[PDB]
Amino acid sequence: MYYSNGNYEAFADPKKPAGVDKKSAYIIGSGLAGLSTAVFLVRDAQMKGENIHILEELPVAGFVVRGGREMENHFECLWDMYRSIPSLEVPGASYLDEYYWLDKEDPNSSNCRLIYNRGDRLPSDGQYGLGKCANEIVKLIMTPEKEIEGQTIEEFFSDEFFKTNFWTYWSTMFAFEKWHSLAEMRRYAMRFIHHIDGLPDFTALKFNKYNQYESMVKPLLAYLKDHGVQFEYDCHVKNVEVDHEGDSKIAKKIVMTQNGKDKEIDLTHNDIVFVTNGSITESSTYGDQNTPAPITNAKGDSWKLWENLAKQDPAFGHPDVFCENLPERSWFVSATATLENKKLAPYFERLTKRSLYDGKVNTGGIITIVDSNWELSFTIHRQPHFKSQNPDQIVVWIYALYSDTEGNYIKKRIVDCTGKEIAEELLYHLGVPESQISELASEENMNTVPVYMPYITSYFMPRRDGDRPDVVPEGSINLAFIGNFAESPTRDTVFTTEYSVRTAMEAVYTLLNVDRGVPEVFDSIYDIRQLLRAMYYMSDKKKLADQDMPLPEKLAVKTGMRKIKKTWVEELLKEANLV
Amino acid sequence: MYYSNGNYEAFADPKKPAGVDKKSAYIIGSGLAGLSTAVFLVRDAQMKGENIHILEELPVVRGGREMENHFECLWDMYRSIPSLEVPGASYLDEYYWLDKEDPNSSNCRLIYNRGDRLPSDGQYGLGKCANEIVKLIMTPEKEIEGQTIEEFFSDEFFKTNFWTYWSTMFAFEKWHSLAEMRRYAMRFIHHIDGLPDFTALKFNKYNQYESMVKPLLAYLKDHGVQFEYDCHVKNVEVDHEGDSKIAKKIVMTQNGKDKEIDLTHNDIVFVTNGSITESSTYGDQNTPAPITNAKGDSWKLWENLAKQDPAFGHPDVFCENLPERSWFVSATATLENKKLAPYFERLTKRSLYDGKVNTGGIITIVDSNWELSFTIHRQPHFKSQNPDQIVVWIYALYSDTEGNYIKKRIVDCTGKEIAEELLYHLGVPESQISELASEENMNTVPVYMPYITSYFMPRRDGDRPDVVPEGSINLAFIGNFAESPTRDTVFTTEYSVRTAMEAVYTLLNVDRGVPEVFDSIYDIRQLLRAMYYMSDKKKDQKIKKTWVEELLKEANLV
Ligand SMILES: CCCCC/C=C\C/C=C\CCCCCCCC(=O)O
Ligand SMILES: [K+]
Ligand SMILES: [K+]
């Protein structure tokens, strides 16, 4: 397979690859990576739909894990996929079209990103406030990824850096903890460089009409069903037995339980197996208005399956680094709070400066309470987020970056709180008078459901050589790993739906010999215009000569500025507002 | 309107723009820019086809150029055009699959000495003259207004293989626009690895009319687009109201009769200003093409517009006082049997008769006095060719020099004489040349095109009108003499399509991005790669060293 960019390869359709009529696919896991794998097999490999088998764990607001993340314009592979998927909401258009038009009619932005002091906007909200710490980000970008394997974010950055607005925005919007992968943080800084101008106000974000299941999954299900793709339910895959001959690796048998019955699927080299290794949602537990979600570190089918594959070959990854020994401080709890009436509306509208009731964007993404002990953030998407909402209901999402600290108002770790308690802590930080908080958080007014997710932070655990298996392991004849614990050969970023679609595309194009380019990760880190733009924005719009940096670097900059005067390079710096 | 890049904007379909149902379009000129205007109007503006009027000068030449992968706008258009040759597929798909099955490359780019490959063929051979190219890219465009190529480069630069390759493949003459040469060097930086062997180039299956024009005509006719024939537009009368400019009347002769079309601000006029093919003449095997500098309908129309507003450009800059040395003559030689085939096959090392690429682009005879180049596309180039016919294209960069064998300037030569000069340079024994170039064996037809080099004349700000002039309510200029706001390069079909897209999206308020010029000049990987290939692959041209290597490896540069 090969990588490409530009419209010629984007718009081109591949020829049907040789041999595909003889082949079948077994997709283990029906999350976005698996569904996307089926799409590329149907559309591009031209595999017969009835030869594609999606093995699904499940059988044939308040729901917190039907929920998803924002996207951005440069999700190159994901948009390649969704332009071919009919919209369910807009008949006659693609899903891309629905989303593009929605984004044009109701563009995303935040009027208030950071609050403190029980409801005041942080006075420096909007500013990165990096000062000389910006140099640290530059130094990270200039440090090769192979030099920083296993290292954490806090091992690299200064104490000062973690006190900056930049770190607040970054850690909260991406869910980076200080003990997470430095290499992944570097990948994010490179990957999303083109959006440095749009991070504090979230103008860089785009969102679906509805919750992820409704908006992103249902159109895929409809498309796959329409092409005769086979869905197997109540499937619990215990293992994929892999044969070794020479340097070749061949999936030989799928071992599973389905409808309570032990089954095996015998495979040949023409049966292609795609494994979603690992899960960030598995083992989630649920509380309710009056009950905490039970704390657990149980492993389910996904983690066990990866363990069983890992035992068979050193190239099949190391699940333990992602699912074992996560710190107590990790993000675990997310909650949805349903406002049942309009009593609390003014406490949110005073922040967003927008009506909650007009169907358009509200918070524009998370608001973070910077002096909350939990590092509590909340967001209100455009509404309704669930089509089942009555017209008076508004659904608020609530999350805590720190799980080991007692709250400011409710003196408990978030992991020990009922839904009502989580709501009470929020209301406290919104400025609701304390005498009203108990009533305003009670069921007549709000219903709040917490979920404890042991592995929600797992994608970002520091990685060493071999921890993630290659999408197509060397010598693999008919076996791929897909999803956000697989190792794409690119520098793409995990905890994104783009990465799921990418691994699907790379797996299918590689194993089925699809003769069309896979888009490279969008090359903004190599675009001089974006490098210069980022240095302008990151410094809170200082000219390059005025930016705080160690004196030898400052001297180097002055010398260089003299070297390029009156040249095209100077025009590029002027265009970037750096001179 | 706005510029974009990436797949999100590429794949997105625009909403139907407000007010389009009350609007019509008048497209003056049916070259590629005009047809492309109509495609964007139908597909993206959703203007009714019956409200789109293409005014065609002809009642009722065929040859075009290569393309490359980063023709972003042109591929945006052709992915929506059904292929005529491969039913069920887009034209882009036809072309993409063909390019994969029969990829283009040249095994012989430069020849001399009556049929030897030049010994340094394949090398740029720039040496320190490479610095001059760097200097040019580092010179702001605003500093080189009106300058010519020969005003900037050293005598030594013009002796380099680089200049031979560049001048002949792009038809840059020494007195042409330096700014445009700079734009070509920046625009096509991503293909520096592929210029001497033409692996950068892609070609249609057939001649430009058959391959590029016919599918457009089918698409537009299928959508109800109106074609008006034998239209000779003499003027577009433009009113001025405050700062606004509004096309008010089209004045034209159609079918022997004078007519006027009255316009409102909802009738959108797209003018292809100027033409490189206008006033072309044809000779035959035994007759030179008649020589001329006549201005025709297109030049006269641009002049009549230029008179009405200083924002409407200055055609005289491009169409007057072209040097006698300019390229004027192209010829097609049809081989009627296989008697001459070895003289081409010895060069290409490929059979002429297997339907696959042959010369891969022009071969230039570096020691010919005319600077004669010739190409043999994949065959047949015309569907009407009999199986034993092979069509060869021939051009001369210099029109003011006597040939080496035929002692005449190309502009004074019959088809047969142009063939004889070619066969001389292929190493055919001179005693055999007259018979082998005779009609039983070769039939050669010369064309004289007075304006073929006009796109590249040195220009200043304002000489090309903006695609949508400031304050224009319903008038656009399209094609390769209009000024796109980008750094894009003329003498390309890509530029035609770009101006069409810019004009339509601007005047009709289409809310979708127009792809920016592909940004390879800003991609540091390409800056580094270009330095490597331009120097003929030179390296030459501690802990930190190791991190630099690791970074380069991380970016696949090593
Ligand atoms: C999001 C931040 C992006 C800002 C731009 C990033 C990088 C700019 C490009 C490289 C800077 C060139 C100087 C390299 C510094 C080397 C210092 C060192 O020897 O360690
Ligand atoms: K709103
Ligand atoms: K051939």
Ligand code: NA
């Ligand atoms: Na930016």
Ligand code: NA
């Ligand atoms: Na296509």
